[PDB]
Design a binder for these strands. Structure first.
Ligand code: MGT
Ligand code: SAM
Length: 405
RNA sequence: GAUC
């Protein structure tokens, strides 16, 4: 693979969206036969329903190169190969916060100043902005929003307890009156597992009780966990986390509200079916990878604007699917479809975009993967432009180049 | 995925 034939690094990013959905929202009746249960599948290599066989195989052999390469020795080449590496978290708690700084700019203040379809803001600067942040420890996403909105925003967060819990005291700004954590059933005493029906309903009730029963203006979800030793099966291993995050959106996001969620590879029809559901439920959806997302990984984001009225059937349906997933844990079964492949493919415009997205992200990732590998086999190579690139990105995004401590 |  020739990685040196990649486009020049740049602060400028382009975005294209899915076509706006014209078909009606699926109801309970229509979806009554949509859930397919079959053998649990831990193989990814043949998932070519929305991606060319060459591209899928190339990005997997490119990942698997590092199966025998030293992990630290690999991340040191990664640090050198990635032109956007030096940005890091600037004065925030992690680099994840700068992803929201990155994307809030690109999507025209969609999150810090949410509008409706007509161009009218949802919140009067001279009212209060409500947001939710799920699967979110230590809290970088909320750190950005709170730092940007001060006391004009109130955030509700749920994440897994443990070493990766929220770190309020480390927020550059914020306080307990700006950001209020809730861990599911039991409240502050829950575990924050978003994949539990109890926690789901509980956090939903909580968010509604504090948003005039309207829900939040937007939701951000950035869920992930270690897939060490079996990295290639990352999409499958986190299939449920993805579903629960899409579901949480349909559960607490107000009408006309927004939603941004981290996904990984989207080769399986299970994942693609989920996006299709978001596409039916929101006024406009796109798949985007910001430059603050490392170019060799399968990380991208799905950005959703304007929640449609009457999405409750889809909400109930997905809550129901999640329950089956909990029931099929440690068994040889699994939910492999949430929307029939014929229905997804029935929409040519959706499918055309979805395929084109998968492929353009594969080719970029392959090069970056090949790039890291080259930076392993040669430690003198480097991007001499990291400093100047970082500088323009902060200028562009309106992030002051000041320091944390 | 975050961190080291
Ligand atoms: P993130 O964990 O999804 O990815 P990250 O930004 O942290 O980059 P990194 O893990 O270091 O590597 C990028 C992609 O390659 C896969 N890896 C990592 N890794 C150590 C490893 C991978 N793949 C195989 N086949 N074998 C390996 O030992 C990551 O999951 C990313 O997709
Ligand atoms: C790396 S973080 C994202 C970073 C975060 N957005 C930030 O800016 O700090 C991913 C989080 O998802 C959480 N997570 C994974 N599985 C979860 C689950 N089933 N329920 C709740 N949180 C989960 C992890 O604990 C982890 O904290």
């Amino acid at each position: 693979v020739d990685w040196r034939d990649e486009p020049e690094p740049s602060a400028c990013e382009q975005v294209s969206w899915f076509p706006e959905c014209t078909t009606e929202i699926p109801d309970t009746q229509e979806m009554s036969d949509w859930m397919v249960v079959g053998k649990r599948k831990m193989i990814i290599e043949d998932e070519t329903e929305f991606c060319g066989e060459e591209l899928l195989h190339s990005v997997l052999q490119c990942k698997s190169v590092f199966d025998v390469l030293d992990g630290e020795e690999m991340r040191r080449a990664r640090t050198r190969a990635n032109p956007y590496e030096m940005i890091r978290g600037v004065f925030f708690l992690n680099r994840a916060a700068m992803k929201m700084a990155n994307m809030d700019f690109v999507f025209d203040r969609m999150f810090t100043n949410p509008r409706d379809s007509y161009g009218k803001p949802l919140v009067k600067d001279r009212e209060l902005l409500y947001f939710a942040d799920v699967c979110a420890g230590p809290g970088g996403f909320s750190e950005y929003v709170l730092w940007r909105k001060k006391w004009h925003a109130k955030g509700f967060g749920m994440t897994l307890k443990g070493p990766n819990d929220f770190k309020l005291e480390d927020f550059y700004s914020a306080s307990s009156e700006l950001f209020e954590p809730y861990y599911g059933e039991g409240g502050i005493d829950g575990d924050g597992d978003i994949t539990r029906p109890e926690n789901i309903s509980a956090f939903r009730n909580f968010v509604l009780d504090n948003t005039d029963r309207k829900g939040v203006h937007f939701l951000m979800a950035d869920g992930g966990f270690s897939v060490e030793g079996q990295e290639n099966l990352q999409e499958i291993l986190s299939k449920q986390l993805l579903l629960c995050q899409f579901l949480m959106a349909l559960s607490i996001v107000r009408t006309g509200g927004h939603f941004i969620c981290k996904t990984f590879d989207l080769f399986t029809p299970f994942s693609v079916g989920l996006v299709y559901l978001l596409y039916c439920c929101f006024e406009r959806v796109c798949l985007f990878k910001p430059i603050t997302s490392r170019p060799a990984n399968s990380e991208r984001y799905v950005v959703c604007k304007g929640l449609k009225v009457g999405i409750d059937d889809v909400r109930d349906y997905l809550f129901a699917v999640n329950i089956k997933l909990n029931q099929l844990r440690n068994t040889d079964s699994d939910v492999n479809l949430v929307v029939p492949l014929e229905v997804i493919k029935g929409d040519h415009e959706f499918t055309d975009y979805m395929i084109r997205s998968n492929e353009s992200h594969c080719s970029l990732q392959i090069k970056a993967l090949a790039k890291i590998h080259a930076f392993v086999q040669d430690t003198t190579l480097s991007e001499p432009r990291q400093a100047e690139i970082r500088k323009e990105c902060l200028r562009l995004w309106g992030i002051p180049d000041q320091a944390r401590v």
